[PDB]
Symmetry: C3
Subunit: 279 residues, 3 copies
């Protein structure tokens, strides 16, 4: 275990493509290429100061939109019908997201930077709030890193969408694998009608911007359990198995009927030899 890799300064202009596609069984998803849509959608990362142009195409037969949390966008990128920012069937649009660093305002106040654990999702499918689109799966993680932020080995996204994790059948996970000592990042997003409490066995994080204590000064409560509600996003990083060891470490919503009905997954933490004790 050596010194942490950290995020560099941003400010570069970046470009991707995104498609909205019908998937099997009435689901809909975002993808970086036609035929490539996933639920959750592709993870988008940026460094504070980066600009992102998303060349967007709706391949479906209903209007769809891309709406993002926390980042800078003009009203023309709001991704709503009210702002005439949605996309007709077979149409395209360029959505532009911007980000900025923190800094002293001319009025003496300190302007918060864009950095955080955020998300994007449809605002027009089935209702003008994207209720149907979100149900069907159009949602995905966005991470904006501040310069100096600690980088993980792997990032995993867990979305509680109504009664499902990542729109999966009950009791299907997903499961994520790590090796003891790995620095693992989780993005935790909630959607739909219901409140949840996210819980992770054998690990804990700080309730704050990065999910990690900035040092001894940081008062933030340290927690393994966090209540969340539709459109909430937070994130954190743990050292897999730290002080605990290898094992199949459950994560799950802690609402009792929710865990019983199956919103449950495994953080599978292997010994260096690839074996998991007691699993």
């Amino acid at each position: 275990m050596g010194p942490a890799k950290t995020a560099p300064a941003g400010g570069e202009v970046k470009r991707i493509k995104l498609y909205a596609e019908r998937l099997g069984g009435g689901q809909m998803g975002y993808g970086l290429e036609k035929g490539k849509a996933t639920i959750p959608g592709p993870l988008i990362e940026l460094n504070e100061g980066d600009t992102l142009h998303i060349e967007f195409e709706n391949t479906m037969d209903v209007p769809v939109s891309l709406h993002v949390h926390g980042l800078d966008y003009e009203i023309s990128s709001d991704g709503t019908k009210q702002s005439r920012s949605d996309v007709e069937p077979g149409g395209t649009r360029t959505y532009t997201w911007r980000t900025h660093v923190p800094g002293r305002r001319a009025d003496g106040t300190w302007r918060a930077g864009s950095a955080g654990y955020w998300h994007y999702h449809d605002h027009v499918v089935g209702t003008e709030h994207g209720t149907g689109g979100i149900r069907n799966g159009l949602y995905g993680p966005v991470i904006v890193r501040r310069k100096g932020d600690v980088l993980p080995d792997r990032t995993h996204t867990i979305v509680f969408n109504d009664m499902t994790i990542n729109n999966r059948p009950a009791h299907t996970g997903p499961d994520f694998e790590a090796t003891v000592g790995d620095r693992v990042e989780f993005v935790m997003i909630t959607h739909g009608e219901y409140y949840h409490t996210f819980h992770l066995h054998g690990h804990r994080w700080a309730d704050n911007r990065t999910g990690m204590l900035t040092g001894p000064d940081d008062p933030s409560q340290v927690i393994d359990n966090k209540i969340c509600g539709p459109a909430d996003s937070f994130g954190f990083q743990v050292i897999a198995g730290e002080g605990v060891g290898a094992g199949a470490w459950m994560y799950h919503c802690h609402v009792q009927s929710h865990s019983d009905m199956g919103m449950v997954g495994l953080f599978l933490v292997k010994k260096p030899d690839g074996t998991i004790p007691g699993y």
Copy 2:
């Protein structure tokens, strides 16, 4: 720039009336026939004392209960403490506030500063379920010396399934000009949890809703879960980095969105116009 709050400590006095409004609604007001939902904004600087000369203008008992401020049990505003007000009655409710400081035990005593609220504790039940439903609630802000002052303050209450007891899809909308420093007080009441969301803007989840400086670890959010009696606030620079537009705020619980808990933060260009609206 950035006007700030002065040091507190004055003794202050206001009149407050509970009154019936249209259709089974009830509200607090600063003058008879002037009641509003939400009630009048009460602002204090830490150390201030507030004497409230309270008159119940209605035909049923009512009370005034406040969160976070200093009050003796006789100002609790409950039946249980015999602090409520009979129909037609008057009472003086007293709220006090204090600054932070070191205690004799060595700990750090938190001051009164923050985003708080008041509301009835006796109407319809001994928890004020009927009164709160009917609209007796209002915002209270206590400022610490040095706190940044806004240009305008707006109160948004999620009360059960309504915003400020309005009919669905009625707003309210609030207007601003790009660059204005705008304060929001966000209160929740009733039966249900909600998630408050504002397009195009973000705030720090902390006492003032703003980062204190480069060392403040607080998560920066546009979406916040809230339950009955939850109280928070923040300030934004209107349109900062995003420009003008009709910027939606709304509950993010999907059916609540769909059922009309929605409003607009209307941010005008200097010329008074809103793009896309």
Copy 3:
């Protein structure tokens, strides 16, 4: 006089714990047979302490001990999948450890174990402990950091589904203090529902200790807090500070919940023992 503070930890400690049936379908944890309570006994450790829990299952159904926030190996997870439950009549030793904060090799700052936590059954009735938790097997755990301020008294309030501590509606509990006492509350939530915890006449910081660290701590100061199953938090107040003696209500603020009896009293006495208006 200066507050008492928590000492450095690092001792190896040991206790016995029993799971046992109580009246009317209730189940509880206890320090001695016949002694089970709901909530179960308070367990208090200093960071670095190790705790060996010598556990006996007194009941006819398998039961388990699962804990939040503390370090434990998978063999102390307390779940069926890890084969850490305890057969009826059986015994097992569960081991919880704790650690202090400090720098990692990678240069980051490792969070310590300190906090307000809880333990409960993971096993009875479903493999999430739904029956067990409903029956009352849950309890508070506090892990203190060296230097943390210590109270005169600690009280545990658990919102479990629609009850406070599995008590009948409108039964409290009520807690007594004298004006000026330093009183600690551990607030835990279990079951199916979100709640909001509210305390009249007092307030705390929403943060690790429930108290502001000093003039630079940004944490919101609150009298009202939303919580959901398995959330835990705690705080300490000076009873009656700036307010005075009185019967100070606490309750869930969801209106139907308070109307239906999730309510209790923080009874703050004058030094002579009397409470005004009560």
